[PDB]
């Protein structure tokens, strides 16, 4: 098994209220759903990623990443996030990420295509 | 099948000289390998993703995002990138991406945890 | 004088400890020195920057940027931070930045030059 | 003098057609003025930033960043660009950034404030 599969897999939550829900498979996949709190969202999305399954064993966190295409049977909202964080597990566990939003534009407009943001995840609220 | 399968399916290659090898399915999948030229990486390693199976169709791109976990068979180092971008087909077709490279650190060190950058993906060269 | 000119000037803290010192100017001026509690750092570096004078005004921030590079008499870490981000008033007043930390590199690492991260300023603590 | 002052001071051009003209002091200053291409902007903006006065002496680019508040007589966008990056001597001199461009905004829409993107500039075109 991964070192931190059974750390990652389950239910997270942000400061803005969505919710991660995620299983770690013992090769580093990441598989689940994502449900936003915030933006031209609704209901539950697709999502995938990675994770490295044997960490520094040195108190280090565990990298991580993972996307989310905002295409369901609900909406399409013509964009991607991609969240790229650590791992950091113990009796508050942390996921603590930085992400990459992208919306199809025009080439004109391609300048002004991708927000940056930084999301933390707990397992409480 | 998704508007850009066909497009978005086959070999990369970014500006540092790195293979980006991916398959894009009906439903929004993105599966494949990545093989950098640059860091702490030899051969190739997992990838998956999402992408926007049904775009805006204005001349605007296709959104998509994807992970590597850099860890293989050869190397861990211990870190993960996410690309966040869009797909802009035609004859000369390009994907244009930000990043996000995360490593594991201590919590002393979390600052720094995190590097940024950007890669185009052309299917030459 | 500028909208939150008085709000701005003064003495913030991040929550790494760092220490920010900012005169707001009424014509969008920002000077001052920042300390780092973090990293190849000692004493105070000058810095500079802008800020919006004449605000929206419906419970909007005012957006503002400022650069830090790392050489002061006592060290050079040849590199540069810019912070770019929101001050948002009241009895809990808070700057919200994110920021680009770059290192000068050879043209064959100039990929891994640059960090990203949030720091998040306080009048207290 | 700045290693760097002479091959700072200048005027530049970024890939979108934005002017860059700034003046490299001695001390690490940068003082200038910014007209942008696109977005909601018209003429010249006033920046300010740092640079790395003493680079390393090994083909290590020179760390620098600048800011632009997007107000002037003509227009107020309420919003703040900083560019972080490293100037390359030569004689294909260029500046190569990452920006960071925040907005005000409200608390509620305060996770969508800020678009990340990269420029390059020349002393051409």
Same mark, same amino acid.
């Given at each position: 098994?991964?070192? $931190?599969? =059974?750390?990652? /897999?389950?239910?997270?939550?942000?400061? +803005? %209220?969505? &919710?991660?829900?995620?299983?770690?498979?013992?090769?580093?996949?990441?598989?689940?759903?994502?449900?936003?709190?915030?933006?031209?969202?609704?209901?539950?999305?697709?999502?995938?990623?990675?994770? $490295?399954? =044997?960490?520094? /064993?040195?108190?280090?966190?565990?990298? +991580? %990443?993972? &996307?989310?295409?905002?295409?369901?049977?609900?909406?399409?909202?013509?964009?991607?996030?991609?969240?790229?964080?650590?791992?950091?597990?113990?009796?508050?566990?942390?996921?603590?990420?930085?992400?990459?939003?992208?919306?199809? /534009?025009?080439?004109?407009?391609?300048?002004?295509?991708?927000?940056?943001?930084?999301?933390?995840?707990?397992?409480?609220?």
């Amino acid at each position: 098994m991964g070192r $931190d599969e =059974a750390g990652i /897999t389950g239910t997270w939550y942000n400061q +803005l %209220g969505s &919710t991660f829900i995620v299983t770690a498979g013992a090769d580093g996949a990441l598989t689940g759903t994502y449900e936003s709190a915030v933006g031209n969202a609704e209901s539950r999305y697709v999502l995938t990623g990675r994770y $490295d399954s =044997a960490p520094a /064993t040195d108190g280090s966190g565990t990298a +991580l %990443g993972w &996307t989310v295409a905002w295409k369901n049977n609900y909406r399409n909202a013509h964009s991607a996030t991609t969240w790229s964080g650590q791992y950091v597990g113990g009796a508050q566990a942390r996921i603590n990420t930085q992400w990459l939003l992208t919306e199809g /534009t025009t080439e004109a407009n391609a300048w002004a295509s991708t927000l940056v943001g930084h999301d933390t995840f707990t397992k409480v609220k």
